[PDB]
């Protein structure tokens with residue numbers, strides 16, 4: 001198997017973990033108590049940092065279920081975390097409901113983190129796609 | 137090549153299929169007739185279930201083209217389907233238009249399914265990233 | 273390493289490039305000057321085309337930072353680009369702010385392009401998941 005190094009910047013939150021072996025995502029928690037009014041957005045810290053491996057990407061998705069059903073989502077979904085980035089993971093949350101505010105308590109699940117391989121091609125300009133080495 | 141097992145829970149819908157060999161996504165259909173009013177959302181069944189392989193993830197994306205141009209999207213995009221999950225695939229659809237309802241007929245394309253490899257690291261807490269085995 | 277062929281359909285825009293070696297995404301630019309009013313959407317050309325390799329997918333994501341903080345996103349995020357598709361990459365942008373228009377100048381960063389491997393299974397119908405060859 002493999003590992004992902006994680007720092008709890010906020011030591012009072014629980015350590016994120018993969019609940020079941022097959023689960024693509026790991027839930028991340030809110031470091032903040034906030035109320036997001038209808039149609040509004042706010043950047044919320046998760047209180048963790050990660051060391052995504054070289055050649056991979058971290059992907060931050062909204063969650064399904066009750067959270068989605070109340071209209072919680074992420075403005076820039078999917079959020080990306082580069083191997084470079086070892087700062088706090090912060091999530092740009094939006095309330096897509098038109099009438100009902102979303103109350104978020106500190107410790108509440110607000111997003112999930114996936115990890116995948118990523119290709120890192122150098123972009124090479126061509127004048128047209130009539131070049132050797134391209135898909136037919 | 138490879139295969140993905142699919143169950144038609146709703147036997148009266150057509151079987152989803154990859155239209156062209158290179159297509160990343162396979163279109164999924166609505167099992168329901170519904171009208172989504174401006175700014176509203178609703179959870180809609182696709183009438184299918186899939187068996188995502190161990191070590192992979194299913195990813196449910198909104199479609200481009202006319203659907204996107206009328207403002208159809210998915211609240212929690214991208215939706216994820218774990219190797220665990222063999223229930224019906226349901227899509228949390230939202231109408232992002234401010235004035236015009238979106239009419240969806242049973243059998244209409246409402247999302248696309250991609251399949252990718254996924255990494256499944258165990259999350260290991262560290263006090264800081266000054267540890268052996270990490271990207272430089 | 274690897275390469276991705278890119279055509280500048282609009283020769284007056286700068287060539288997109290991976291800013292740092294570990295960056296998952298490459299920023300794409302607007303070929304257009306446009307103002308997106310609150311809650312409105314518009315399809316904007318990037319002035320480039322790409323040749324995604326066989327067996328891979330291009331993924332077009334919204335960007336984090338100031339763009340996300342003003343409410344810029346993509347209706348059908350993540351946008352997908354197939355190995356088939358060698359036309360101009362166009363982005364369905366939406367202003368998720370309720371009050372403040374988003375001004376986009378020609379040359380402004382409006383999205384990022386990731387490249388990943390993708391699985392291309394043939395979908396095979398089964399009557400139930402009680403079949404050989406499936407995850408336990």
Ligand SMILES: [Cl-]
Nearest residue numbers: 122123289290
């Ligand atoms: Cl490059």
Ligand SMILES: [Cl-]
Nearest residue numbers: 017018258259
């Ligand atoms: Cl874990």
Ligand SMILES: [Cl-]
Nearest residue numbers: 153154394395
């Ligand atoms: Cl197929």
